[PDB]
Ligand binder design. Structure first.
Ligand SMILES: CCOC(=O)/C=C/c1ccc(O)c(O)c1
Ligand SMILES: CCOC(=O)/C=C/c1ccc(O)c(O)c1
Ligand SMILES: [Ca+2]
Ligand SMILES: [Ca+2]
Lengths: 116, 115, 115, 116
């Protein structure tokens, strides 16, 4: 599991459950190509997006559908989604944990990168 | 000044100065059309991006070049840039301030929407 | 204005208005002596807490009553308050802005220190 | 484990390791009494601070020694420490995860509260 995403709700002090996200990888022609997708579990985590073999060097974008999340709670949020764009595996394979903390008008995102 | 952006540096505790950014507006074919751009001032602020006549309802993306900012400081950053994507919605009388707080491996952004 | 505090509301995307806070200065017996206090304005800012003659080096604590703020909005908060504890250090010419961004179960604070 | 604290470093994109913290509980005379203490592990986590029996209703303060952390990395930070003060177990036993994200001039803290 070289890529895991964890989403928290700062309003309810809970994991953010059933949050959809799409991962994209930049192709040689500079377009974003679909790479993987999924929804967070009860712990607010999404595991198993990719494998070490498949997760090659490149520029990746994680689009977290924060807007649908807030909507289903009755909240009309500011952002369309939270975006995280980064170069991966530039110096060799790493494990990446992307954490996102959500409020209706704010979000923060951090990465934990560890050497396999 | 319907839209202003403020950027802060969490490593040095200062405004983030000379940060470049581009603002895009979502087009009907779902591509991003450039709309406005600039560099943050000494106060870390970017003013005069648009006018209220021009700033109509729609989806907007602010793309902040955080990577070049950290490179200039000699610090290896995680993100390619920081993106803030939002819908502008008439309410009516409203001004938008988008604040970003930057660290090498983290960023946070908030909107202050007033009248 | 050597020290100013700004508070923002991440749930409503606005300044946090009428937030009460107290500033303490660490005494030699390691207890906190009240120093200054006030309520945030309509811009979510608290100015005029101290003067530069009075604002000498030392350890300071700003205690922001976030709990009363969320109670007034009908939202059950996690924190009793938000505390920012820092050392003021001559550098020399410096102004301090302490910003806090509040959510019911989270807060973030940053210092912008300029000249 | 009704109380766990997790500390992350936003400058290095890593867990914040060997970070000291002290926990205090407000006594009936309004003073802060020592409750528990420890240092974060290699995963940036501190487990086993307390037990369900011992962790009664009350107002608790977690003082995270962020200043020593930054110092040992050669950084002169803004804050003396990060403080988290909260009422616990007011409606019955809960499990609390306190997360703290650190930069030299900034920190954020969030709580995840789950019903046992
Ligand atoms: C409009 C002025 O914004 C500030 O001075 C600070 C904003 C801010 C945004 C996010 C944060 O986490 C924070 O601590 C502060
Ligand atoms: C138990 C939560 O584990 C985490 O990775 C929390 C990360 C985190 C992300 C953003 C924040 O503002 C924060 O305080 C914490
Ligand atoms: Ca995993
Ligand atoms: Ca545990």
């Amino acid at each position: 599991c070289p890529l895991m995403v964890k989403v928290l709700d700062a309003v309810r002090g809970s994991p953010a459950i059933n949050v959809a996200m799409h991962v994209f990888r930049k192709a040689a022609d500079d377009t974003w190509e679909p790479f993987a997708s999924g929804k967070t579990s009860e712990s607010g985590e999404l595991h198993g997006l990719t494998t070490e073999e498949e997760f090659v060097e490149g520029i990746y974008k994680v689009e977290i559908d924060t807007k649908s999340y807030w909507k289903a709670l009755g909240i009309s949020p500011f952002h369309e989604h939270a975006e995280v764009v980064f170069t991966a595996n530039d110096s060799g394979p790493r494990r990446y944990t992307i954490a996102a903390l959500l409020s209706p008008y704010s979000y923060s995102t951090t990465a934990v990168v560890t050497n396999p």
